[PDB]
């Protein structure tokens, strides 16, 4: 998101507003607005690694522009000269890593091992396994969407084609086995 005043209040605020998001959801429900129109109206801009050099980014779309002890804290905004902001920090994660519940709570090597192992998990790889004569296919009997789902799972379409089952785990030291 581009950040620019655009107004007389003086505080720096993003270019995208509730009206724009409403129109986006409206075209969602109808199927008009689209990512292309977002770009054309200049509410979202593409930045590469080299152009990242000379821009100050805001983390939270609202928090850094302008407490419960367990609640999330943030480095204060001593800069009033932000230029862009993240859409959402979760999008730094890739496809396999965004399956994970609470990667920030995980350790990072476990996040890596999961990102390797999820590729090896068992599930429905495609809905046409009856017709494809693949060299080697595995189809879980009863796939299951996890109880704990990341918001990116709907874009990854994991709930539609999940790979794994929900089991009642007991973190218990029962038989020594």
């Amino acid at each position: 998101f581009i950040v620019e005043d655009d107004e007389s209040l003086g505080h720096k605020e993003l270019k995208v507003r509730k009206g724009h998001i409403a129109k986006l959801m409206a075209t969602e429900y109808q199927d008009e607005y689209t990512w292309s129109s977002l770009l054309n109206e200049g509410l979202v801009e593409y930045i590469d690694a080299e152009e990242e050099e000379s821009i100050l980014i805001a983390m939270q779309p609202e928090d850094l522009e302008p407490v419960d002890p367990a609640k999330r804290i943030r480095v204060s905004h001593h800069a009033t000269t932000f230029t862009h902001c993240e859409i959402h920090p979760s999008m730094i994660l890739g496809v396999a890593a965004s399956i994970i519940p609470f990667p920030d709570h995980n350790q990072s090597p476990r996040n890596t091992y999961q990102s390797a192992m999820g590729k090896q998990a068992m599930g429905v790889f495609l809905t046409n396994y009856n017709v494809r004569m693949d060299t080697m296919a595995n189809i879980l009997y009863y796939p299951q969407k996890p109880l704990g789902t990341t918001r990116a799972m709907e874009y990854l379409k994991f709930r539609e084609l999940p790979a794994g089952q929900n089991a009642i785990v007991a973190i218990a030291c029962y038989s020594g086995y």
Binding site: A70, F102, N106, R110, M117, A121, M122, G148, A167
Partner: protein, 281 residues
């Protein structure tokens, strides 16, 4: 023909295995005969280590018009001890044992766990996300609504616990449990709840192999590579060292001569070369 020792009745006159039939071991799946200039067999056998029921068979023409056949075989594969599993937090393990619902521990409400994970997984791996997933998943099943488990949501563990407590349970996910053998209440409580687990490809049915005097290499007359090719094991440099340390010189001699490859070599005393034309007959 040079046909194999596996069964051939599974084939019908057409040359396929009459789908519906099933196979195993070294049963032949496609029946092919190559002319020789009467003929010989070139049929592909089924894998020795894998078996099941033929789901489908395809017959077609390829680009060049030579007939091309694609036979697909189905099997059920059930969790076993050696089968490997993993959560979405790096917690991976092979099954140790399979206990029934009777021997399983059990909660006050009669819910028996599907899996027990040793608490040694948790501290070393620092894996709090597994536990927070379990707590959110319990709240998700208790509320019916899916728990937004995204990376940087506003939600915190205190809120999760407050919801879980409102649903008539622990705040912290513990819950009193009873022994499956005797019904003695467990002296310590068990962290418990639903959690998402995956079945990984690495499973013992596919990773088990043993050898005793199978096919040899054509060049060295040492065992050929791999489970698939009735292969064999290897005695690496490090393991040679371990035996050298052990002092089992007889073990090393037996293992590198009699069990691997033994060749009798006549030599001449004057030259000491492998140039002896030995006619033992």
């Amino acid at each position: 023909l040079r046909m194999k020792h596996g069964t051939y009745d599974k084939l019908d006159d057409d040359g396929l295995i009459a789908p519906g039939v099933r196979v195993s071991g070294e049963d032949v799946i496609i029946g092919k005969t190559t002319p020789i200039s009467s003929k010989r067999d070139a049929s592909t056998p089924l894998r020795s280590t894998e078996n099941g029921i033929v789901d489908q068979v395809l017959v077609t023409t390829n680009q060049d018009g030579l007939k091309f056949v694609k036979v697909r075989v189905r099997t059920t594969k059930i969790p076993q001890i050696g089968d490997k599993f993993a959560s979405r937090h790096g917690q991976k393990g092979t099954i140790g044992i399979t206990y029934r619902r009777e021997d399983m521990p059990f909660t006050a409400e009669g819910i028996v766990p599907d899996l027990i994970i040793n608490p040694h997984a948790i501290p070393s791996r620092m894996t709090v996300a597994h536990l927070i997933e379990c707590l959110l998943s319990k709240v998700a099943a208790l509320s019916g609504n899916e728990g937004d488990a995204s990376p940087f949501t506003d939600i915190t563990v205190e809120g999760i616990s407050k919801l879980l407590r409102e649903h008539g349970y622990q705040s912290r996910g513990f819950e009193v449990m009873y022994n499956g053998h005797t019904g003695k209440k467990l002296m310590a409580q068990i962290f418990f709840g639903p959690t998402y687990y995956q079945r990984l490809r690495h499973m013992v049915d596919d990773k088990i192999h043993a050898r005793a005097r199978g096919p040899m290499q054509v060049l060295t007359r040492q065992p050929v590579e791999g489970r698939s090719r009735d292969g064999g094991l290897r005695f690496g440099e490090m393991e040679r060292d371990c035996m050298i340390a052990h002092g089992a010189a007889s073990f090393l001699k037996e293992r590198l001569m009699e069990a691997s490859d033994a060749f009798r070599v006549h030599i001449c005393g004057i030259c000491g070369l492998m140039t002896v034309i030995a006619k033992l007959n």
